[PDB]
Design a protein around this ligand. Sequence first.
Ligand SMILES: *[C@@H]1O[C@H](CO[C@@H]2O[C@@H](C)[C@@H](O)[C@@H](O)[C@@H]2O)[C@@H](O[C@@H]2O[C@H](CO)[C@@H](O[C@@H]3O[C@H](CO)[C@@H](O)[C@H](O)[C@@H]3O)[C@H](O)[C@H]2NC(C)=O)[C@H](O)[C@H]1NC(C)=O
Ligand SMILES: *[C@@H]1O[C@H](CO[C@@H]2O[C@@H](C)[C@@H](O)[C@@H](O)[C@@H]2O)[C@@H](O[C@@H]2O[C@H](CO)[C@@H](O[C@@H]3O[C@H](CO)[C@@H](O)[C@H](O)[C@@H]3O)[C@H](O)[C@H]2NC(C)=O)[C@H](O)[C@H]1NC(C)=O
Ligand SMILES: *[C@@H]1O[C@H](CO[C@@H]2O[C@@H](C)[C@@H](O)[C@@H](O)[C@@H]2O)[C@@H](O[C@@H]2O[C@H](CO)[C@@H](O[C@@H]3O[C@H](CO)[C@@H](O)[C@H](O)[C@@H]3O)[C@H](O)[C@H]2NC(C)=O)[C@H](O)[C@H]1NC(C)=O
Ligand SMILES: [Ca+2]
Ligand SMILES: [Ca+2]
Ligand SMILES: [Ca+2]
Ligand SMILES: [Ca+2]
Ligand SMILES: [Ca+2]
Ligand SMILES: [Ca+2]
Length: 316
Amino acid sequence: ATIRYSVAEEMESGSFVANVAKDLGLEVGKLAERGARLVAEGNRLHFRLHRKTGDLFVKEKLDREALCGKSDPCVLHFEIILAEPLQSFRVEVRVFDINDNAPVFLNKEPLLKIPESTPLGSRFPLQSAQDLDVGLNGLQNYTLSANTYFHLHTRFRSHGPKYAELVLDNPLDREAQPEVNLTITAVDGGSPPKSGTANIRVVVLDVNDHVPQFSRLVYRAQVPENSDNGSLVVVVTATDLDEGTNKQITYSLAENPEAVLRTFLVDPQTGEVRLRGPLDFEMIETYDIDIQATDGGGLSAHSKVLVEVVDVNDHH
Ligand SMILES: *[C@@H]1O[C@H](CO[C@@H]2O[C@@H](C)[C@@H](O)[C@@H](O)[C@@H]2O)[C@@H](O[C@@H]2O[C@H](CO)[C@@H](O[C@@H]3O[C@H](CO)[C@@H](O)[C@H](O)[C@@H]3O)[C@H](O)[C@H]2NC(C)=O)[C@H](O)[C@H]1NC(C)=O
Ligand SMILES: *[C@@H]1O[C@H](CO[C@@H]2O[C@@H](C)[C@@H](O)[C@@H](O)[C@@H]2O)[C@@H](O[C@@H]2O[C@H](CO)[C@@H](O[C@@H]3O[C@H](CO)[C@@H](O)[C@H](O)[C@@H]3O)[C@H](O)[C@H]2NC(C)=O)[C@H](O)[C@H]1NC(C)=O
Ligand SMILES: *[C@@H]1O[C@H](CO[C@@H]2O[C@@H](C)[C@@H](O)[C@@H](O)[C@@H]2O)[C@@H](O[C@@H]2O[C@H](CO)[C@@H](O[C@@H]3O[C@H](CO)[C@@H](O)[C@H](O)[C@@H]3O)[C@H](O)[C@H]2NC(C)=O)[C@H](O)[C@H]1NC(C)=O
Ligand SMILES: [Ca+2]
Ligand SMILES: [Ca+2]
Ligand SMILES: [Ca+2]
Ligand SMILES: [Ca+2]
Ligand SMILES: [Ca+2]
Ligand SMILES: [Ca+2]
């Protein structure tokens, strides 16, 4: 009823396809004589017939991804018309698929920002790739680069892979490495398989999971009673391994006896523990002051400075 042939994709134009006279029920001379003409719909003119030889050539480089797109059978139809007697013959040439397209990502550099306090076992979806081929020549599998935090889990469908997702195996600690960088690899199933890699940048968001720590737990100080107002008792420092607003330190005098808050002050920024009142050895020999370093998130830490006034009042 209908005659068909098979051709390979992306072969050079003018290349041979088949010989018509054989499977037409005629001979070459008959083809030349009966006026063998190729006719199809106006839009498609993919082939060419040489009458005198009965030879079928392809007129253009056939690109299957353009003609059929994502369709499994790529078939081109056209009819051979004759004359005396006037016969019409339906011909269909199938364009086989080859592996001339590798998988690719639209974002070669995706940006995935994961908070530091992320529960172990959490999953992060990744955008799939695009292999324009069909079947085994299309997408088949994903792989993840060597890593100490993640492992890749590829959600599959019946025909092909749905998409891939990162699964966290280890607790993310920003203080260790604030960023982890990876390369996802998309692999088809052709022979040889073709690959397409993308580069994921995983940024770890700082969480206030670090209380400020004072240098010394106890600050020893020996201050002369005849010292002036605003004289520097001591300088205290507090460190925070975090970043952002969860790092800046706010020093403060809190929960102290009246005398302390009456004769002492502290600089909220620098840590300048200084005087705001007079001193007399006979009245108060020693002060013990608990200062408080407060973090932006609210994590506070205490430390006591033990001041001891020196020299009898007006001894020298
Ligand atoms: C999709 O691909 C994954 C992993 O990728 C494949 O396996 C690698 C080892 C390489 O050979 C890649 O070229 C290849 O694409 C497949 O899952 C994995 O299959 C392998 C089969 O050998 C399993 O072997 C393991 O090997 C390690 C050490 O090499 C051992 O510690 C394991 O105990 C085990 O023997 C592996 O467990 C398995 N999973 C992972 C995460 O690698 C997957 O089968 C494939 N799917 C399809 C449909 O192709
Ligand atoms: C994110 O990480 C990628 C991955 O780096 C690669 O993966 C690791 C797991 C290891 O296997 C590394 O050995 C491997 O490079 C980085 O991509 C890499 O970029 C560099 C330069 O930007 C590329 O360097 C090469 O150097 C050789 C010899 O010097 C040249 O011949 C190459 O032409 C190339 O210049 C490296 O090839 C490339 N790796 C891959 C797989 O593409 C990426 O830089 C990094 N990004 C960030 C922001 O950290
Ligand atoms: C000894 O010094 C303290 C503190 O001096 C302060 O710190 C220095 C580094 C400089 O920056 C000074 O400019 C700064 O004042 C003195 O205590 C402070 O006195 C001033 C003025 O009396 C107070 O300012 C105001 O006081 C009025 C009074 O009603 C309030 O209403 C205002 O709100 C405003 O606070 C200031 O509060 C007070 N305390 C501090 C911690 O600065 C002190 O007067 C001086 N002399 C003696 C004898 O102690
Ligand atoms: Ca192609
Ligand atoms: Ca193809
Ligand atoms: Ca392919
Ligand atoms: Ca931490
Ligand atoms: Ca942190
Ligand atoms: Ca902190």
